[PDB]
């Protein structure tokens, strides 16, 4: 049913909309921008001479193009058939690639939303969902980009992460305030990120191996995802998806890159609240994998060794977790997940390690303060 539909749609190219007709069509990204302008303008948006009868034409165009792209992405052949080498599947994928350029998808993803804001009186002003650009529109873009073009290059992955994925994650992490948490924008953005973006980054985890040159974007991504995980309104499925994504990425990352995330973890884990569930496992996995980096003086030959600041952080984490467990009431799962982390940290730490009297200067934990995080 996919091969028939694709052939029918290419037989009648008018089905693709004026942007993609091809006789001087502006393009998908230009169509989305014109839709933004139309949805902003009152005259072209409305009839301009019961409330449900109001059709926001900008949103209508956006939804049409998003639905078309989603349908084509679903019509794209499955990966295993292409690996087997079926000529018809390869040809269908080639046709879809010809129809939709990758640059247009990247641009449409790069388009940013309009975030809700709180007013002078404290009543948050909310953009109407029935009008304007919605994350569901980008969901179809991501579906097409994953099922047709595919992300198999670290350079493409990093470029996408820098241009389109990271800004939305930052917006979600910034909309985690108490008043703005339950808003429609927040819920829609969480549903988009936890079902389209994060699973993509989880499936593309191996590409994260050789990212030494991009050592800042990875750290930004880790902190943003961790803040989103600490967010409150997230459902159980969304929380699980974030946990899986973070555990997958951190496992493939280099030992040195996780220093910044370790600095945040050593300040939140000792609380041993429910939110520490995922940090405990992340620490356990990290110190089980990269144990040679810490214990042996040589460490990993390619990776190197600790800077003794990581060692200080690790010892502080170990002792904080130990004390918190000591004065914490016995919880079954909490204890059976805290014990492996303590054991892994103890194994990783060199037995004869030097406690440096040179304490850090201006430890900026108050910078990421408990309330407001900044």
């Amino acid at each position: 049913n996919a091969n028939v539909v694709v052939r029918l749609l290419i037989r009648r190219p008018e089905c693709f909309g004026p942007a993609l007709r091809g006789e001087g069509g502006n393009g998908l990204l230009a169509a989305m921008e014109e839709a933004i302008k139309i949805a902003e303008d009152p005259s072209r948006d409305g009839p301009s001479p019961e409330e449900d009868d109001t059709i926001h034409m900008g949103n209508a165009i956006m939804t049409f193009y998003s639905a078309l792209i989603d349908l084509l992405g679903r019509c794209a052949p499955e990966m295993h058939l292409i690996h087997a080498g079926k000529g018809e599947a390869i040809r269908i994928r080639s046709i879809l690639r010809s129809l939709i350029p990758l640059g247009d998808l990247v641009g449409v993803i790069s388009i940013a939303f309009q975030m809700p804001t709180i007013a002078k009186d404290g009543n948050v002003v909310e953009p109407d969902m029935s009008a304007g650009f919605c994350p569901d529109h980008k969901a179809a873009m991501v579906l097409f980009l994953d099922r047709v073009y595919g992300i198999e290059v670290q350079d493409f992955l990093l470029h996408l992460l820098e241009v389109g994925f990271l800004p939305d994650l930052r917006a979600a992490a910034s909309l985690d305030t108490a008043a703005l948490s339950a808003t429609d924008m927040a819920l829609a953005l969480n549903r988009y990120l936890c079902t389209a973006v994060l699973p993509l980054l989880t499936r593309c985890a191996p590409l994260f191996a050789g990212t030494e040159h991009h050592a800042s974007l990875i750290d930004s991504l880790l902190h943003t995802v961790y803040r989103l995980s600490k967010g409150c309104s997230l459902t159980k499925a969304q929380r699980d998806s974030i946990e899986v994504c973070l555990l997958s990425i951190c496992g493939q990352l280099r030992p040195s890159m996780m220093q910044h995330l370790l600095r945040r973890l050593v300040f939140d884990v000792p609380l041993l609240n429910e939110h520490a569930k995922m940090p405990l496992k992340l620490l356990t996995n990290h110190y089980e994998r990269c144990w040679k980096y810490y214990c042996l003086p040589g460490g990993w030959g390619n990776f190197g060794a600790a800077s003794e600041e990581e060692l200080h952080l690790s010892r502080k984490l170990f002792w904080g977790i130990f004390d918190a467990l000591s004065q914490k009431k016995y919880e079954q799962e909490l204890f059976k997940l805290a014990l492996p982390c303590l054991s892994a940290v103890a194994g990783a730490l060199p037995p004869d390690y030097m406690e440096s009297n040179y304490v850090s200067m201006m430890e900026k934990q108050s910078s990421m303060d408990s309330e407001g995080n900044f």
Binding site: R7, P13, G22, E23, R91, S94, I95, S98, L99
Partner: protein, 394 residues
């Protein structure tokens, strides 16, 4: 009684243009060396500008079913609607294909149609479908049919692009009706007999002086005259002429006495013609008119007119034999006979006379395929390099 397109038949693909409310017949053309792209050659203005069918002719190698072609890719037949055909360009020996690289002729979806060397892949193969509801899948394809072609690789029709200022041929989702015209059939050809589109030498006299133009004096205006010369010029490429008939369809048939044709000088690309001052001078494709550039082969000097003969829609009967037959050239309109001025290698001038000498008969010698190919290569290369030199000089 009805003719079917068969494999190993040399044909051309035609399309109709409706620019500013007129019917303009166009043929698919491509030259192997240099530009691999495909362009359109006009055959509607045959009276004013001769068409270059030599780069428009194609040959049908194989006509396999879709199932058989898919099986093969996984690993004198008569064309039937729905089969996949392989077209080989006669001049270049390369096959029509979808290049998968677009020139961006205001159509992002469209692809470019060109020529490719290898046969492997699904780009070279094209499916033939009925363009008329009278025909149906599986039926034999008549010679006088409109055919719609779909690329196996991209499912894009062979499309004629009106939208751009110049006419283009491309692979697009819109469909354009193509008509296939039978140029010639290889099997019916008779050895030693002159057929249309042969590169040949016009040998004169016992000394076998061949009708040629002045040598490479670097003067494109001095090379425009015509004279009889003997010696190494009979082996050189400056004595090669291409005989082109005035008809598009069945242009590769057997040449008959009393059949008008145009003689084209291969290396210079200019057509033989008669001046108003009664002198033989080569002019250009743009100003080669039929009235000036039409010649005839006549068996004898007799003044009896050949009258009018019904043009047979077939290969015809063999009537002119290479070497054995002796022919006399006569201008179609003026009726004058080509002759030597006999004024003094030999370098005797070719003048165009009412009566002429008694020994004005010529002999016809066919040229090897390699030699003809090399001469056209020389012409196409000198054209491009002269353009390059002029641009650099500017």
């Amino acid at each position: 009684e009805i003719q079917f397109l068969r494999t190993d038949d040399e044909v051309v693909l035609q399309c109709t243009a409706t620019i500013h409310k007129e019917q303009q017949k166009l043929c698919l053309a491509a030259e192997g060396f240099g530009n691999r792209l495909c362009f359109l050659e006009s055959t509607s203005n045959s009276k004013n500008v001769p068409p270059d069918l030599s780069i428009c002719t194609f040959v049908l190698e194989q006509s396999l079913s879709v199932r058989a072609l898919q099986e093969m890719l996984a690993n004198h037949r008569t064309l039937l609607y729905g089969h996949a055909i392989l077209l080989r360009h006669s001049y270049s020996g390369m096959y029509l294909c979808c290049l998968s690289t677009s020139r961006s002729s205001t159509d992002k979806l469209a692809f470019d149609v060109g020529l490719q060397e290898d046969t492997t892949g699904e780009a070279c193969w094209w499916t033939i479908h009925p363009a008329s509801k009278q025909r149906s899948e599986g039926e034999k394809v008549r010679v006088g049919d409109d055919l719609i072609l779909v690329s196996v690789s991209s499912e894009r029709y062979l499309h004629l692009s009106y939208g751009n200022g110049s006419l283009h041929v491309d692979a697009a989702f819109q469909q354009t009706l193509w008509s296939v015209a039978p140029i010639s059939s290889g099997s019916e050809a008779a050895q030693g007999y002159l057929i249309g589109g042969d590169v040949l030498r016009l040998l004169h006299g016992h000394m076998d002086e061949c009708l040629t133009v002045p040598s490479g004096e670097h003067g494109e205006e001095q090379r425009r005259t015509v004279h009889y010369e003997g010696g190494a010029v009979s082996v050189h490429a400056r004595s090669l002429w291409r005989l082109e008939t005035l008809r598009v369809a069945w242009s590769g048939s057997h040449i008959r006495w009393g059949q008008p044709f145009r003689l084209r000088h291969v290396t210079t690309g200019k057509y033989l013609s008669l001046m108003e001052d009664k002198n033989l001078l080569l002019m250009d494709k743009e100003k080669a008119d039929v009235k000036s550039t039409a010649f005839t082969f006549r068996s004898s000097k007799e003044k009896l007119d050949v009258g009018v003969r019904k043009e047979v829609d077939g290969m015809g009967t063999s009537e002119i034999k290479y070497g054995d037959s002796v022919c006399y050239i006569q201008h179609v309109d003026t009726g004058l006979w080509l002759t030597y001025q006999s004024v003094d290698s030999i370098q005797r001038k070719a003048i165009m006379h009412h009566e002429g000498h008694m020994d004005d008969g010529i002999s016809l010698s066919r040229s090897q395929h390699e030699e003809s190919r090399t001469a056209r290569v020389i012409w196409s290369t000198v054209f491009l390099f002269n353009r390059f030199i002029r641009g650099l000089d500017a």
